[PDB]
Design a protein around this ligand. Structure first.
Ligand SMILES: [Mg+2]
Ligand SMILES: [Mg+2]
Lengths: 48, 89, 96, 257, 151, 294, 273, 193, 49, 138, 136, 271, 49
């Protein structure tokens, strides 16, 4: 809601983040493509 | 029987693999182990050692120990003379 | 001490106290002119397990010797059977 | 320990000697008609823990006759340790292990009809329940020594009783038996503990008094010239210049006066 | 000359009435030393000492005899430390400070036990603090009762 | 423990701050001890019952006492085929759900405990603020050697509240006596007659008659007037100490003072935090004349 | 009468050997003898098993339980990983403000010996090997000199010492840092040297005295387990104050207390308290 | 008694005759087991007749004045807290408890109960040297009653809470004399020294 | 005799609670009544209606 | 023995015939030695380690680590324990009000000789009590 | 085993007495400055905001997810009378009782009070003890 | 065992330094489950007044902590998928925990599948161990001060900001990102971003940082009141060590003052 | 069939229920009350006879 009460505490926030992380990491998007996205330049040099 | 004693010497699964069993699964015949013992046996029972023992207090105080007359306590300097008394007792 | 050692000893001991041991002890107390101990012991006895089981009993002989000694030795607050009147206590009491 | 139907129900824990193996019993009758407490034979093998001191699980294993319910129909085995919920002291049984044939107590579903005998009551605070006025008195086996229906004050009257507790002004009141309680840390502090001898355990707490041979010349010198300091062995004496004498149980940490 | 006393907050006079004697009288089992010891702002050895004295005063007051094994039960750890010391250095008495071992533990030495305690769980509270959890092997049961030739 | 110790120290310190009374260490710890034993009793009774958490579908069932002790685990044979890792996580998360339910119950119980505790402090607390001499000044009002200065701003914003009736004293005792007068008034009337024969009536007399408790039955056997401990009018632990030894006087005095100070500092911290959260206060001192210019 | 801990509770087929009392089989003296012996020995065997369970070290026990804990039905094959995560990492050190450069363990081919060191840390001075100028003189050990360096740098209240780097030397360092006689230490895989950091307390050192066991390398002192056990005992009280340090037949550098623990005898190095 | 355990004993209502001639309405709720009434609702195990008689024989004494036989005495005698002499509160003490207690007290020493007391000295004891194990402490209450039988707690509302902690945060506001102590309140020091 | 006297007096007369600057009178770095700054502040104001 | 040593033993100069030996030397030596002695507790603190003898003190801590599970690990929901002041309360009264204030609770003239509780200490006092005051004044 | 037998140690010196301790050294006995809070630490006040670090989050200290509410552990005083003593006591409290003057304590318990010239200033009223003198 | 986590102890102080300069301080599953052990071993120690956690960086790396290693995670997720692919392939070659009519194929299908699930279990484990480590830091019994020197990716953000003493040097930084790597942010900082406080002071900032991967720094962590403490002093760690060496008793008054004085003099900003 | 639903929706192998409820008679303050006056407080007062 945004009320000082309705915000999730730390325990539920980690669990929630986990729910989302777990569900997204399956999709080829993350593991097949985005993980290699941030590699350095000479990393990509060596791989190519 | 120690370190000076004569030495004792020495893909798939072995016959030692089978007998073994996960403690999560219920065992063979349900021998009623006391929970406390199986805690201690497995190393997870909270220690009470002699290291956690402080001073052993005097609770009920004994008695007044009254002065017991010795041979060095005499109201005359005689009887303590060198020809009689070698020491207090 | 003997009375404790009678149930304590593994080899020569009885599991519970026999009658014999009870009247023997009581007889000793009587024969020592030991008053307080005789009383307490008697009461303790009838408070025991052996007594409620029926194993140990108070007999007539124990009872009457107990009473005899009760009579013949000084009681703290009162005068007792077997207190000999002193003729000369009139010096203080005033009565002969 | 609770009451129903006129009798006692106690929870207890049976245990091997090494306390390796254990069984809880929830509601056990406490019935003092049993010379010795009876268990089912099925447990004999459950409670057997073969330690180093007892290579076989038990010290004593025998056959006996003992048909109370209802020629060797049972087994005496022990020792076995028994913790009753009420009591601080373990009670060590050597119980009758009875097979199903000799006596079978299945009596109500799930209910094994166990009870506790005088084997175990003699060793408890439960024993105090066996004396006149207690809750086990009714169920004692009939004797010349125990009268069934007499009121308590009647019986106690017959023994010693006259009045209520400490009712006569001649007998002191029970609670003045102890007035002061001595705890060093809440009052006056710890003792100053010295010794003369070999150890603290081998000697006396006492120093030697002034009447000693070697102390007299010194103590003299101290009585005469009091203000100057004086050599001697007269120091080691229980007597000295200072108002505070050395004798045992000086409380030296005291904020006195 | 006897005027003053250390520690004025607990007076010997006021421990004459024993605390909550109307409760632990009636089921002395459900009342381990902990429940009471939350009462005193003192340290451990002193407060168990005091609890012993309470039990004794109380018993003498109700005209019954006190449990003499209570000082063994509250001080149990000390009892066994002493039995075993006496066994080791051969002497009869109470082990005092000069005779303690000179071992120096690391700072985190207590960790194993600390996670064992923090994670322990108990079916009921009696199991939590019973008097005898100090004991596991038979040796322990032998040293804790050597004195009663009964037990 | 903690929440309680904070409040008790609030009470002790306030007791010496406002009037010259000291609370005996004995007393201070015995309050706490009662909170503790309360909790303990709640634990005693809480272990007689069980809580059931469940994971996937109903496939994984975990039975656990609210304290968190694990009792039984029922499992579908479907689980047996997973992996030890996933079996572990599954039972673990069931266990977590049990702990959730148990801990919900528990927290209700705790709220109950807090309430009984407050009720038990109330004769003391009220006891200090319900006196003809008790007063406070606003916290933002400057204080100088003679006395306290007026805070200038918004002459409307400052309202002095008064707890006490200014005419002749009406104490809580009088109110409880009023209550039992209306109890007897209702009872003794017709229509209070027919009500006392109802189930509502016998419920009321079940719970709130003490006078009918048979001898030896647990609980209070009379109805009690509320406790009266007027703070400035009752000497407590300072009188005994001041007679016996001055040193312990000065030390107990000291403690009460220090506790008071500590409490006040905490209240300043919470104030500060609440002030930063709403963004009226910065995160580092920007105003040093509010500190250095004294 | 509810019973917890026995579900079956009464076995019907089960009755004791003495109670059922089947008529005793008559064995020939051969039978009776063989049975008395085999069961005597299975009692011997049992007694052994119990004694081993008693004497098992805690480490062994813990290992046992989290071994059984993780155990699955099939003995699963290892999973292929990243090219490696398994290189022992290189201990962190600062390049700029430094005693010595922390040398990579990947350069292991470059390294020399204590005797013939490969060129590294050119900007620091190099410690020299200490050797006799003539015959009667003692033959020094990089233990002797290790100890006297530490001693002297403790006297001048220095915070760091550079010290000779051989095996039993950094062994001794680890032992001392265990017992908390030394603030810390590092080997940079420098060949000649490594560096120790000294600890002070209350104005003076944490080290009263530190002495080598042997003045020469030509003298080698052997410590029996009983001797090392004597050190521990101060007239009946167990005393771990002073630390004595050993080589083992196994090339480990140990204190005397672990040694006594497992009853191994070892060669003396030094003593420090 | 407010409680779950507090239900009464078995009581007579007459034959079918007087029962149809007693109850007008009857409404039933499903069967559940019998709880044996607690010890304090049980009339035969609780009977106080002897102590009631003791009260009555002393009843005329209760109607006269209180007068000190030390004349010149005014100040009241202090009775301290927790002393066993002054305890009025029985929680579980029935006739049952009082007799169990009586007997244990009597076999402790008999000479407490004699109007003229004989010499009381300790003699031996039949249980052993450790007999205290089978004797000591006070008679124990049955645990079912200890735990379950307690009155229902009158529910505390949130209103009374809100008020109490209001009063709590009223007393935590500052008093004007504490920070800088007036020179006027620091003259007031007296010691018994 | 003097030092004991001073000790008692300084202890009984010490202030506590929080002053206008938010801190105790014994606080480490921040102070109250510097060079009788409050004494003078009362001097020139005076307490009157 | 002057120090109270039971278990110490001490030797001066190997053989007792070794120079220098003076009574001065014999005293000053043992005093030197004893002055160089390090106590064990001090040694243990020196290395940053806990002495075996002192560990018992951690026991109550470690104890209620173990005993904290459930219901004693519980803190009341919503309640921190720090209750900030908000309003300003003053119950003080003019004196003629607090003269007759308590007289149905306690006795009349409750505030009589009370100087802090009254701005007028002498009110309500009957004459002779007022006289007592000036009487000890002179 | 050890055969050294703590029972039999020690040497009899004849009449010469000596002190021994039942448990700890007597200076270490009364700990009152940490008990009654007489130490500078408490007065400087500086670090007392740290009892309340939990306040640094408002919505948490209400909701009690984390069990550490306090400086050393679960809460501010779990213990407070025991734990701190695990540090070896280097600088023990000693004798604090002020009910008499130093000179009156000294006078009563020490012979040294009779010889005020033989004692240097720093030790003047400081001894509670009797001193033997031995002229070598 | 791995020389990943190294430490330096004084009398009363404890320094735990994460050493992984190669991965930019990204903690592996094992190394995190390890750090939870070192952190609370150091935190439940008897003589620790303060336990300081920081990044040991030999000048190779400026990160204080990375997140989970995304290289590892991505790798084994990819392997897991590959095995689902082969298993599916032969499941469709026979079709043209998977129970079949054919023993050979049931066999190797179930082998492949079981292994896939093992990989995924290692990922799962990594996430669990990180989250639990964060919890460890949050619930530490004795004071744990996190000296944050250099950058943090998500779960590293979590590791630094939730210690009850979190100091920021200037170099400290927070990158909560990862929709940029095609994933949702992890590390708990989400709570901090959604506190009603942050909505008050910086409305819209929460979405700014969650959507756009964008760094936050010392100043903004301070203004949001995420942490209270800040310092410009070189090598604070040494000074903390040697300050707590001169410190004396263990009574919580002494501790309170010592810690508090240290905080007031350096980490709280005055003058 | 622990979580496995049946044909018409009923549970196969009926699921386990929790008996836990907040006990309502448990206030400690009336368990240990004042030794003579019956008030439920923790307040120690020394009365007069
Ligand atoms: Mg372990
Ligand atoms: Mg010569």
């Amino acid at each position: 809601d945004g009320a000082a009460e309705n915000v999730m505490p730390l325990a539920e926030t980690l669990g929630t983040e986990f729910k989302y992380f777990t569900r997204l990491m399956r999709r080829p998007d993350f593991y097949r493509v985005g993980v290699h996205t941030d590699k350095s330049v000479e990393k990509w040099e060596e791989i190519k | 029987g120690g370190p000076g004693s004569p030495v004792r010497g020495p893909r798939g699964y072995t016959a030692e693999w089978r007998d073994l069993r996960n403690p999560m699964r219920p065992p063979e015949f349900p021998t009623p182990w006391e929970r406390k013992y199986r805690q201690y046996a497995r190393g997870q029972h909270p220690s009470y050692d002699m290291v956690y023992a402080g001073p052993m207090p005097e609770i009920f105080p004994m008695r007044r120990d009254f002065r017991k007359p010795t041979r060095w306590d005499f109201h005359d300097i005689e009887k303590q003379g060198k020809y009689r008394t070698s020491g207090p007792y | 001490a003997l009375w404790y050692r009678a149930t304590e000893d593994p080899y020569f001991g009885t599991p519970q106290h026999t009658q014999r041991q009870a009247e023997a002890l009581l007889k000793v107390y009587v024969q020592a002119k030991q008053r307080g101990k005789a009383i307490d012991f008697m009461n303790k006895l009838r408070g025991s397990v052996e007594y409620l089981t029926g194993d140990i009993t108070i007999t007539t002989v124990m009872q009457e010797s107990y009473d005899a000694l009760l009579d013949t030795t000084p009681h703290p607050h009162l005068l007792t059977n077997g207190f000999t009147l002193e003729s000369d206590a009139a010096k203080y009491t005033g009565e002969v | 320990f609770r009451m129903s139907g006129g009798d006692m129900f106690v929870e207890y824990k049976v245990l091997s000697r090494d306390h390796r193996r254990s069984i809880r019993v929830e509601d056990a009758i406490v019935d003092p008609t049993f010379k010795r407490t009876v268990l089912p034979l099925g447990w004999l093998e459950l409670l057997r823990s073969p330690s180093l001191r007892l290579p076989t699980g038990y010290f004593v294993e025998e056959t006996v006759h003992v048909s109370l319910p209802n020629e060797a129909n049972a087994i005496i085995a022990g020792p076995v340790v028994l913790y009753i919920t009420g009591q601080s002291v373990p009670v060590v049984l050597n119980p009758y292990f009875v097979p199903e044939g000799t006596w079978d107590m299945r009596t109500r579903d799930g209910e094994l009809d166990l009870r506790l005998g005088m084997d175990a009551i003699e060793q408890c605070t439960l024993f105090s329940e066996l004396r006149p006025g207690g809750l086990l008195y009714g169920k004692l086996p009939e004797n010349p020594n125990v009268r069934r229906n007499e009121s308590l004050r009647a019986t106690l009257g017959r023994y010693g009783m006259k009045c209520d507790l400490a009712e006569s002004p001649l007998v002191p009141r029970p609670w003045t038996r102890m007035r002061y309680m001595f705890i060093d840390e809440l009052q006056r502090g710890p003792k100053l503990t010295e010794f003369v001898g070999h150890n603290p355990r081998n000697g006396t707490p006492w120093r030697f008094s002034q009447n000693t041979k070697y102390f007299r010349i010194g103590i003299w010198r101290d009585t005469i010239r009091r203000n100057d300091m004086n050599e001697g062995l007269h120091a080691h004496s229980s007597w000295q210049k200072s108002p505070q004498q050395s004798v045992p149980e000086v409380r030296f940490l005291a904020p006195y006066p | 000359r006897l005027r003053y006393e250390i520690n004025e907050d607990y007076k010997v006079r006021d421990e004459l009435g024993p605390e909550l004697f109307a409760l632990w009288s009636k089921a002395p089992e459900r009342w381990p030393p902990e429940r009471l010891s939350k009462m005193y702002g003192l340290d451990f050895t002193l407060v168990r000492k005091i609890l012993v004295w309470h039990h004794f005063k109380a018993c003498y007051d109700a005209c019954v005899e006190p449990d003499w094994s209570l000082p063994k039960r509250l001080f149990a750890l000390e009892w066994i430390r002493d039995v075993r010391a006496r066994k080791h250095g051969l002497f009869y008495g109470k082990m005092r400070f000069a005779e303690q071992k000179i071992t120096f533990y690391s700072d985190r030495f207590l960790f194993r036990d600390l996670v064992n305690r923090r994670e322990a769980s108990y079916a009921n509270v009696w199991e939590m603090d019973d008097p005898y959890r100090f004991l596991q092997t038979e040796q322990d049961y032998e040293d804790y009762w050597g004195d009663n030739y009964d037990v | 423990m903690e929440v309680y110790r904070r409040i008790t120290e609030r009470v002790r310190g306030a007791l010496w701050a406002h009037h010259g009374r000291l609370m005996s260490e004995r007393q201070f710890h015995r309050i706490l001890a009662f909170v503790y034993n309360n909790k303990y009793e709640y634990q005693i009774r809480f272990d007689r019952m069980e809580v059931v958490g469940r994971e996937w579908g109903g496939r994984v069932e975990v039975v656990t006492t609210p304290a968190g002790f694990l009792k039984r685990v029922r499992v579908n044979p479907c689980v047996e085929d997973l992996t030890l890792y996933q079996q572990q996580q599954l039972i673990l998360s069931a266990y977590a759900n049990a702990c959730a339910d148990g801990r919900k119950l528990m927290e209700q119980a705790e709220m109950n405990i807090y309430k009984q505790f407050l009720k038990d402090l109330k004769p003391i607390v009220m006891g200090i603020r319900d006196n003809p001499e008790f007063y406070t000044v606003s916290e933002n009002s400057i204080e100088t050697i003679g006395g306290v200065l007026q805070t200038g701003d918004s002459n409307n914003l400052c309202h002095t509240h008064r707890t006490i009736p200014a005419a002749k004293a009406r104490q809580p005792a009088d109110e409880v006596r009023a209550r039992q007068e209306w109890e007897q008034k209702w009872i003794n009337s017709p229509r209070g007659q027919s009500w006392a024969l109802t189930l509502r009536g016998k419920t009321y007399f079940a719970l709130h008659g003490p006078q009918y408790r048979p001898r030896g039955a647990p609980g209070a056997k009379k109805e009690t007037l509320p406790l009266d401990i007027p703070a400035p009018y009752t000497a407590m632990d300072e009188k005994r100490l001041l007679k016996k030894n001055w040193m312990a006087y000065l030390d107990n005095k000291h403690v009460a003072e220090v506790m008071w100070t500590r409490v006040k500092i905490a209240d300043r911290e919470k104030r500060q935090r609440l002030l930063q959260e709403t963004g009226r206060a910065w995160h580092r001192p920007i105003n040093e004349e509010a500190i250095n210019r004294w | 009468a509810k019973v917890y801990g026995a579900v079956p509770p009464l076995g019907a087929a089960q009755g004791h050997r003495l109670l059922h009392g089947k008529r005793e089989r008559e064995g020939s003296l051969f039978a009776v003898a063989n049975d008395v012996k085999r069961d005597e020995r299975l009692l011997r065997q049992q007694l052994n098993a119990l004694l081993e369970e008693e004497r098992m070290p805690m480490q062994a026990r813990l290992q046992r339980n989290e071994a059984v804990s993780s155990h699955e039905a099939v003995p699963q094959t290892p999973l292929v990983d990243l090219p490696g995560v398994e290189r022992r990492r290189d201990l962190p050190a600062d390049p700029i403000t430094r005693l010595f450069f922390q040398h990579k363990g990947d350069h292991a081919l470059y390294y020399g010996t204590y005797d013939k060191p490969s060129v590294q840390d050119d900007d620091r001075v190099q410690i020299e090997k200490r050797v006799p100028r003539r015959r009667e003189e003692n033959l020094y050990t990089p233990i002797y000199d290790f100890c006297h360096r530490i001693r002297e740098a403790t006297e001048q209240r220095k915070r760091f010492v550079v010290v000779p780097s051989t095996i039993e030397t950094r062994g001794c360092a680890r032992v001392m840092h265990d017992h908390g006689l030394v603030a810390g230490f590092r080997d940079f895989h420098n060949d000649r040297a490594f560096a120790v950091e000294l600890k002070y307390f209350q104005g003076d050192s944490t080290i009263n005295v530190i002495e080598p066991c042997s003045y020469d390398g030509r003298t080698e002192f052997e410590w029996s387990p009983k001797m090392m056990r004597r050190l521990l005992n101060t007239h009946g009280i167990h005393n771990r104050l002073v630390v004595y340090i050993c080589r083992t037949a196994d090339n480990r550098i140990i204190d005397h207390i672990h040694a006594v623990k497992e009853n191994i005898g070892g060669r003396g190095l030094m003593m420090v308290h | 008694g407010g409680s779950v355990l507090d239900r009464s004993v078995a009581v007579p209502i007459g034959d079918s005759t007087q029962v149809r001639e007693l109850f007008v309405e009857t409404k039933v709720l499903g069967v559940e087991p019998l709880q044996s009434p607690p010890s304090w609702r049980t009339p035969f195990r609780n009977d106080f007749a002897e102590e009631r008689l003791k009260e009555l024989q002393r009843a005329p004494f209760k109607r006269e004045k209180y007068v000190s036989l030390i004349q010149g005495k005014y100040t009241p005698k202090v009775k301290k807290f927790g002393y066993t002499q002054h305890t009025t509160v029985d929680d579980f003490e029935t006739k049952e408890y009082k007799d169990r207690l009586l007997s244990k007290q009597f076999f402790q020493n008999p000479q407490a109960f004699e109007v003229v007391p004989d010499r009381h000295e300790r003699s031996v004891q039949f249980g052993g040297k450790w007999e205290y194990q089978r004797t000591h402490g006070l008679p124990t209450v049955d645990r079912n009653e200890l735990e379950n039988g307690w009155s229902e707690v009158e529910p505390i509302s949130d209103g009374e809470m809100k008020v109490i902690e209001q009063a709590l945060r009223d007393i935590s506001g500052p008093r004007p004399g504490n920070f800088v102590k007036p020179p006027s309140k620091t003259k007031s020091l007296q010691l018994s020294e | 005799m003097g030092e004991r006297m001073r000790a008692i007096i300084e202890d009984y007369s010490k202030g506590f609670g929080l002053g206008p600057h938010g801190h105790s009178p014994t606080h480490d770095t921040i102070h109250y009544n510097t060079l009788n700054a409050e004494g003078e502040r009362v001097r020139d104001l005076g307490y009157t209606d | 023995c002057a120090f109270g040593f039971q278990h110490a033993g001490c030797r001066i100069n190997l053989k007792a015939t070794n120079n220098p030996k003076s009574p001065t030397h014999t005293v000053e030596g043992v005093f030197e030695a004893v002055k160089a002695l390090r106590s064990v507790s001090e040694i243990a603190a020196s290395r940053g380690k806990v002495p075996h003898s002192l560990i018992y003190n951690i026991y109550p801590y470690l104890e209620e680590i173990r005993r904290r599970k459930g219901m004693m690990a519980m803190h009341p929901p919503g309640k921190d324990g720090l209750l900030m002041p908000d309003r300003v309360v003053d119950n003080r009264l003019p004196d003629h009000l607090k003269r007759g204030y308590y007289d149905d609770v306690y006795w009349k003239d409750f505030f009589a000789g009370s100087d802090e509780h009254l701005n007028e200490p002498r009110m309500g006092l009957r004459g002779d009590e007022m006289r007592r005051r000036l009487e000890e004044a002179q | 085993k050890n055969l050294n037998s703590w029972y039999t140690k020690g040497t009899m010196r004849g009449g010469v007495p000596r002190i021994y301790y039942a448990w700890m050294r007597p200076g270490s006995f009364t700990r009152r400055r940490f008990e009654k809070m007489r130490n500078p630490f408490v007065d400087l006040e500086t670090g007392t905001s740290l009892y309340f670090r939990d306040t640094r989050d408002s919505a948490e200290a209400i909701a009690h997810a984390a069990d550490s509410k306090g400086i050393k552990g679960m809460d501010n005083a779990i213990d407070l009378y025991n734990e701190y003593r695990i540090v070896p006591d280097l600088y023990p409290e000693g004798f604090q009782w002020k009910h008499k003057l130093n000179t009156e304590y000294n006078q009563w318990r020490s012979n040294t009070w009779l010889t005020p010239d033989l004692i240097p200033k720093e030790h003047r009223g400081r001894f509670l003890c009797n001193f033997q003198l031995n002229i070598v | 065992a791995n020389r990943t986590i190294t430490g330096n102890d004084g009398r009363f102080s404890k320094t735990i330094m994460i050493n992984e300069p190669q991965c930019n301080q990204a903690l592996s599953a094992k190394t995190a489950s390890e750090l939870s052990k070192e952190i609370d071993k150091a935190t439940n120690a008897v003589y620790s007044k303060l336990s300081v956690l920081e990044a040991a960086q030999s000048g190779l790396t400026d990160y204080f902590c990375g997140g989970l290693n995304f290289e590892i995670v991505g790798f084994e997720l990819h392997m897991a998928a590959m095995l689902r692919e082969r298993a599916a392939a032969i499941l469709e070659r026979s079709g043209a925990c998977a129970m079949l009519l054919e023993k050979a194929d049931e066999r190797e299908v179930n082998k492949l599948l079981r292994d896939a699930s093992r990989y995924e279990d290692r990922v799962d484990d990594a996430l669990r161990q990180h989250a639990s480590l964060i919890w460890r830091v949050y619930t530490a019994p004795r004071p744990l001060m996190t000296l944050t020197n250099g950058k943090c990716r998500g779960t590293g953000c979590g590791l630094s900001l939730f210690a009850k003493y979190c100091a920021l040097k200037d170099s400290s930084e927070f990158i909560f990102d990862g929709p940029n790597v095609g994933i949702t942010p992890y590390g708990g900082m989400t709570r901090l971003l959604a506190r009603p406080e942050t909505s008050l002071k910086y409305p819209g900032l929460a979405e700014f940082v969650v959507l756009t991967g964008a760094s936050l720094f010392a100043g903004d962590a301070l203004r949001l009141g995420w942490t209270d403490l800040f310092t410009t002093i070189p090598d604070m760690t040494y000074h903390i060590k040697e300050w707590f060496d001169t410190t004396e008793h263990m009574h919580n008054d002494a501790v309170a003052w010592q810690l508090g004085h240290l905080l007031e003099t350096c980490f709280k900003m005055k003058e | 069939g622990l979580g496995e639903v049946d044909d018409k929706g009923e549970p196969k192998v009926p699921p386990l229920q929790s008996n836990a409820s907040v006990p309502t008679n448990v206030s400690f303050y009336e368990m240990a009350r004042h030794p003579w006056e019956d008030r439920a407080s923790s307040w120690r007062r020394d009365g007069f006879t």
